[PDB]
Design a protein around this ligand. Structure first.
Ligand code: NA
Ligand code: NA
Lengths: 281, 288
């Protein structure tokens, strides 16, 4: 087994991995590592697709989606939540502190406040400016820790200028994120509607369950999804879906419909940016 | 060549009230109509019924006395629509169908879902009946949803799921019913499945996507429902929980019109209407 190891999506995954590794390298829990990892990007107003600084919906409201899954089938999720900078941590509170696994809208905010989270104005001057001008994708992280336990976290401000109330894949278990401690974990990149449609990360993990490596599973999910896009009469150039994945042995994999995505991997070899295979050549 | 036997049209729905919801779906299916129209019409009957207290009008409120409704819908070509935690609209399944057909999104929640519904001509209505208000105030001091899946005369699958959610849930709580892959999943080249019960547990295990993938890899609909239930049973134990506290059922249909179901605990039936008639059937259960 190769452990610990953490993967996360996009260039900022490299920086998120560093924070995750501060936990993983000291023998801490995957759950804590992935929370710490993605909060880094939630916190950063120059990362405009996650948390603080996220581009608003078309009504100028910054609404955030996140979910988290630990090594023993515990889950939490918030969607379309406003004024709280660290939705992954509220999702973690939904998981640990309530008998529910998903809260949305005003109810998610009220819960957050009741747990001692603080309202903050998430719309930056920069985002407000660009929104008004307009009027005229996420971070996912999965890790295997020194105990051989998996966990993962996904957080986003969702599609810029979405309809108010729009929810993407990031807070939906089996779409944006899925973890089964006996199999593996996967988290998605791409058009949220399309990852929901195909239940993408549950598919990747079930393909690993069925005996595929993380790499084979990501590629086979994407190839199945490519055929569905065609069945739907759509142009593959208009659709992005991709996955990164980890199994219980610390093997990893990534594959997308289209070139141009990258993801960060940190293990005993250190932290680096790698690029997946892709279908649309 | 096509199958020697396909049982179509056919519609299945969860719980005893599925029997009369099936009659309404069959008005569409028996005339060669689309599975998508059939399953919408079928579940709207229950949404419309104030005496059905876990779906639509008359649904028991969250703990603050808001009736907030969840539904999703899926047709024969991976088109999907979903609303969740939506207030004041009696037929969330039809707003879900509008999300699917009329927007570039697949899920709206909360205020945004209501504003969209109003923009589409749905009418704001008071969904809290005197009876539900009475019970709620007192509280202060089975049939948890309807899922319906159908195979029409063309050989196409579609499904719908709609609920008012756990009674006296936290404000904003969403269960499995509006989540594609949890409460409902339909793939026209394999089969369809819809779920009922403790929504948290169906979300946890991505239940209907799992049932349909098990059919994909060769299980019959009943085999796939049963194996999914038994996975939930294993997970409940891994989590150190007591199975007695949990109910989940699945019903499932494949491309040939074969069907099946299975649940954790007894007392769950489903209704199936095909050309031979409308039947209330009782599946096996895990907790014996
Ligand atoms: Na940010
Ligand atoms: Na009702």
């Amino acid at each position: 087994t190769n452990k610990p190891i953490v993967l996360s999506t996009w260039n900022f995954g490299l920086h998120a991995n560093v924070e995750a590794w501060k936990v993983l390298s000291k023998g801490g829990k995957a759950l804590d590592a992935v929370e710490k990892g993605v909060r880094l990007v939630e916190d950063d107003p120059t990362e405009r697709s996650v948390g603080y600084g996220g581009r608003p919906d078309r009504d100028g409201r910054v609404t955030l989606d996140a979910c988290i899954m630990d090594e023993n089938y515990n889950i939490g999720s918030v969607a379309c939540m406003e004024h709280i900078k660290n939705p992954i941590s509220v999702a973690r509170a939904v998981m640990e502190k309530t008998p529910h696994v998903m809260l949305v809208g005003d109810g998610a905010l009220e819960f957050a406040l009741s747990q001692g989270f603080k309202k903050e104005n998430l719309l930056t001057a920069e985002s407000e400016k660009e929104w008004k001008e307009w009027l005229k994708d996420c971070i996912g992280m999965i890790a295997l820790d020194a105990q051989g336990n998996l966990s993962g976290a996904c957080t986003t401000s969702g599609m810029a200028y979405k309809m108010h109330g729009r929810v993407g894949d990031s807070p939906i278990i089996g779409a944006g994120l899925f973890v089964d401690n006996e199999i593996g974990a996967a988290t998605a990149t791409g058009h949220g509607e399309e990852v929901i449609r195909t239940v993408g990360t549950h598919l990747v993990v079930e393909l690993m369950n069925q005996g595929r490596t993380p790499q084979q599973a990501c590629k086979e999910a994407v190839e199945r999804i490519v055929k569905i896009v065609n069945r739907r009469g759509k142009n593959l150039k208009d659709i992005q879906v991709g996955f990164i994945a980890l199994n219980k042995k610390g093997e990893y994999g990534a594959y997308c419909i289209q070139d141009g995505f990258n993801f960060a991997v940190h293990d005993q070899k250190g932290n680096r940016l790698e690029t997946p295979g892709f279908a649309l050549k």
